[PDB]
Amino acid sequence: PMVTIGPNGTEVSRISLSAINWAMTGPSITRKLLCEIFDRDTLAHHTLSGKPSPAFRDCARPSKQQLDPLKVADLVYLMTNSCDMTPREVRTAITTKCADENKMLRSRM
Amino acid sequence: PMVTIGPNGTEVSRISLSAINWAMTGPSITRKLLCEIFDRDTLAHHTLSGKPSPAFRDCARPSKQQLDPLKVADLVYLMTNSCDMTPREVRTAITTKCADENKMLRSR
DNA sequence: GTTCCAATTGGAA
DNA sequence: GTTCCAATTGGAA
Structure with a gap:
């Protein structure tokens, strides 16, 4: 049914996990998981650190509340062990997903 | 004298190559080669693409020009065949060095 | 429809 | 004395 991603016990389903083509780039896969771990509006109103630019x-x-550090930590733990990338790549893939979600929300207005 | 870097025909100090510790990070080494390929005043006035933010x-x-594409392409060519880092990492290390060198001038 | 590019900034590391 | 972190942007890919 569901599978724990990291030590902190954060989990997503196997269905969406199996519905992912691992042939594409790491960052893209990271973005696919963010829409499976978090919701749309959460990503749109949150950032990686919660700090202003x-x-x-x-x-x-608009100041944005920090994303869940425990959930992100597991994601970083996953990609570094599966796709074998660096935490820097993941955290940059995450910080650019929240920004793109912020764009799209503005596109509905 | 000086040693070529890539096929596009750009060379760097032969001495400075020997004075580089390859145990360091990719971006670090990239930021050391830039100061040996480009002048400090050029880096503080140029960027990767030349485009504005x-x-x-x-x-x-104020307008900032684009770095020499052929010189950059060789720099990217070196790091990928030696340290085996990605062109993504190299181009990101360059756009920061040019941004950091501009901070030097702004303080002065 | 979504991701990438890379420029800009100040404090932290 | 330098590098790193990452937030934010609009068009390009």
Whole structure:
């Protein structure tokens, strides 16, 4: 039914796990899991660290609550053991997914 | 004298090559070769693509040129055949060095 | 429809 | 004295 990703006990189903083509790039697979671990609006209103951008402290932008550190830690643990990538690659794939989810939400308006 | 880097025909200091510790990270070594291939004033005025930032298209920033594509292509060629890092990593290390060298000038 | 590019920034590392 | 982290952008791929 469901499978724990990492030591923290965060889990997704085997159905969506088996519905993934592992022939594509790591970051893309990471984005596929984020829509399976988190929801759409959560990714759109959260960031990787919960910090504001240093390049916008003048004009500012909506402060976003930090994503779950425990859930992300398992994802980083997965990709580094399965696809054998670096945590830097994963955390960059994550921080660019939340940003793209923020774009798309604005596209409905 | 000086040693070529890639097929596009760009060379670097033969001494400086020997003075590089390859035990370091990919991006690190890449940031050491850039200062030996490009002048510091060039890095502080040039970028990877030459394009401006999409987040600052209305906020007009001073124009910064593009680094020599042939010189960059050889740099990317070296790291992939030696340290076996990805072209992604190399191009990201370059766009930071050019951004960091600009921070040096801004402080001065 | 989604991802990639890479430029910009300040403090932290 | 340098590098790293990652947030944010709009068009390009």
